[PDB]
């Protein structure tokens, strides 16, 4: 079911101009932090809940490395979605992170693309809420909720407009090119879509559970 939801989210972007991109899961420090407008010892590190091996080699907390390498080698326009599994100390989950960099985009276009993404995924007429939040690689940054369960607001994805330093550090002029990005946890979408309440079943791999999605 995690791969089914992953294919459902990607096909919206796949047949609409975006190309699926993947990368390694064991990353270093630059492509995961220093290239995302994180100076280093910033409070956005949290070395506790991030699996690491040395001091400059760790497991992915998000699929940011593929988006970084795509900007450093390729030149805008860039239209990609980056699925894949990531890791944190709590432990393994998937999340899809799209990236769009063109000659010009805006916060208005990010909100519209995200709204009909949530509407056409869940196949409902959802009530979405845009809250302001913080991410070192976006400004303005936002977090989107949907009125799920019984009138509750549940976070589904974060987004924002790519920070100028993130474009400038990868060789893209932040004055000639604009860009936005987002990131949604796949297990969050899969549970709200299929009505699952314990995501530990996603990786226990009980054949009776998997058969329910066949």
């Amino acid at each position: 079911p995690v791969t089914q939801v992953q294919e459902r989210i990607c096909q919206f972007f796949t047949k609409a101009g975006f190309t699926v991109a993947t990368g390694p899961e064991v990353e270093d420090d630059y492509h995961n932090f220093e290239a995302l407008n994180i100076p280093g010892h910033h409070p956005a590190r949290a070395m506790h809940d991030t699996f690491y091996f040395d001091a400059n080699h760790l497991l992915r907390t998000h699929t940011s490395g593929v988006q970084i390498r795509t900007m450093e080698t390729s030149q805008p326009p860039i239209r990609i979605v980056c699925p894949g599994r990531v890791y944190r100390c709590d432990p393994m989950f998937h999340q899809i992170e799209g990236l769009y960099v063109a000659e010009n985009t805006s916060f208005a276009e990010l909100k519209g693309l995200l709204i009909n993404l949530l509407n056409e995924f869940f196949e409902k007429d959802l009530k979405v809420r845009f809250r302001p939040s913080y991410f070192p690689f976006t400004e303005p940054s936002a977090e989107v909720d949907i009125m799920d369960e019984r009138g509750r607001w549940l976070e589904v994805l974060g987004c924002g407009m790519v920070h100028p330093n993130v474009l400038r550090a990868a060789g893209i002029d932040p004055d000639k090119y604009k860009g936005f990005a987002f990131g949604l946890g796949v297990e969050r979408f899969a549970m709200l879509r299929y009505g699952i309440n314990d995501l530990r079943m996603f990786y226990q791999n009980d054949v009776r559970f998997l058969r329910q999605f066949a």
Partner: protein, 777 residues
Amino acid sequence: MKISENWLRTWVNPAIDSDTLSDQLTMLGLEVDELASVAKPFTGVVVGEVLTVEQHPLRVTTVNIGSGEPLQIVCGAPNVRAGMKAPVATIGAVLPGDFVESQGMLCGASEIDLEDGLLELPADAPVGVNIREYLKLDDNVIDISITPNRGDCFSIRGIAREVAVINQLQMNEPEIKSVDATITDEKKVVINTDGAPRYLGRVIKNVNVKAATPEWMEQALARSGIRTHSILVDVTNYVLMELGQPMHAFDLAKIEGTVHVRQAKPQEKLQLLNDQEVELQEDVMVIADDQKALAIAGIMGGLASSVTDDTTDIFLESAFFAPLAIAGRARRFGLHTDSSQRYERGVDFELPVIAMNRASQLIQELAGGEFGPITVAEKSDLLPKREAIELKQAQVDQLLGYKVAAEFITDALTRLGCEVTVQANGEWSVVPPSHRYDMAIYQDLIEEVARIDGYDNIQISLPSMDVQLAKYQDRFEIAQLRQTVATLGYQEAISFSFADAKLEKQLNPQVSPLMLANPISSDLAAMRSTLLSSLIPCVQYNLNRQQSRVRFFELGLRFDYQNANSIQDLKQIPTLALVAVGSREPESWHAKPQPMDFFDFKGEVEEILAAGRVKVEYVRSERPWLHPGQSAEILVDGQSIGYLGRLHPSLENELDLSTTWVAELDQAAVLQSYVSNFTELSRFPSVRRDIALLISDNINVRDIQQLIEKTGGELLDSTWLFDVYTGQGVEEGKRSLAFALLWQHPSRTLEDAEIKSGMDNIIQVLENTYQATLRAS
């Protein structure tokens, strides 16, 4: 951060319900995780005054609730009674976990969701007034979640500024009165570093360190999560929560000489207030004198310079520490204090003098002392620069996608504390305030416009792009691989990329596993060198739940760390794995359930390779976790792309498994691109011929086939083995093989002379090469 809503509304009262107040904060970027009352709701009970007791060790007593006759309550509360003012339930049952005739119980200190049993009130006993109103128990505790960019919002002053801007009010900032200097016994402060561009110190002598703690300051700190200790630490904690500037008081009798704010000496020892002894580094700022070290600058004080109950003279610190000189040092020693986190995100550098006056006035009110002059150690031009930021109206239009009124842009920025001057026409020069550490570029200011104007006012639009047909070469897609494997009867599994090192060594005892530095458990410590180390537990999971048949396949990554001298030598290759336990087909009336053999499993793997136009050759595999006789290495162009075979029976039995069949293949080889070329078809019939062999048992059938196809020539179209015999009439050590030979000519009918010439050539080669006896059917 927790703050009492009543304390917040003394700074700004928006005249709206408490629910909308939190939704305002949440919609301003400061998400409220919880808004609950200080205490849980219960019926109207009043703290009463006890009149008399009746001995009888329980203890019968009489309590006066200020209404009619004093009630008779029997209790066994060992606290001070017979004249005390303690809470007591008149009549009812409303406790969260509870409920002269005995009518009620002398209410205890606990069991009221906010806490010696039966604690009497201090003084000022109300006669009949609800205890929830006397202790302000109906106040709300707002649990704010502040992102690291809003370092100013870590206090009542920071939150009140946010509520005032969204409601278009002006904060009721409490006018602080400065304390004049009566004595002149100040200390000397020298700044040896650059991480403290503003240090303020004041000397106060003869303070009552052992008596105060007002009820209003105790509750304001308790509802923010801070408990009470001494009086000076409570004063410094209150001014921390009120204004945002942390402070600390030292024992003046334990500071010998000039006060130095410097970088710590290499491995300089220091015992902190939590009795923890740490050895610092030349990277962490320290507050020292001319001999020893007193405190880790802005994180935690030392046990030596702490203000104890034997303290008479006190030196008050009120400094601004640069965030880049404090970030990470607290966590380095396993510390997360209120002063450390606020300094890391950014404290308003114009607050030391204001917080010094606040704590001094508070100290003089709650304690006595002679206040000396404030020693100002300030290195200007090193303070946080708040240079003006250019901001055009065309920038906010293109970055937001919609047009916000220029009246709102200037007004919203001004209420947030910015000095915006309309340069020329249509353009602005915005000077950020001193408390905002997140305004530097014009993108920060446009986010402020969207924050104040509203994220619900962001208009909907769609991005435009040029439709260009991207490059694509025909290949075996990942979605088509899942469909093929699913048709073969396998369920997709997703196992953890890290597995147990014991199972990783059980499979391959000569493995060099990539192990985690902070694994979540022992069974999730080593990154899987093979997908089997993480799929076998899932196979055992189902088997431990009455599941005879389980067939998995996973498309993940394995981590090849063998013969690697460093971490960058790691090879993370995507693989397709297959695990099968049980019968090949589900139980039906067609046959009794029986597990697969090597040829049932090979037939499935061959079709997966055939689905991607992959031409392979099989050789015996040497994987330690495989049956040596029934294992195969899958070779493409001589190099291995994977393997298949039976799990080693000794390993198969150690894990309590039935006949298991495992296989792994590199995704790069299976999901390959391909190109097909058309070759002409003959208009003329083919000629079928059979060949029966009697060959040694240790000659592979494939070796015989490629020798027949080689010596056969161009006229030989196809060959395929159609029978193997190993019964009566075959000497032990040999076997009977029967090959079919399809002959084809491109442009004519084959003559019987050519075929017999080819057959005699093939039998002569097979007779001489392998010493075999042949026939020609």
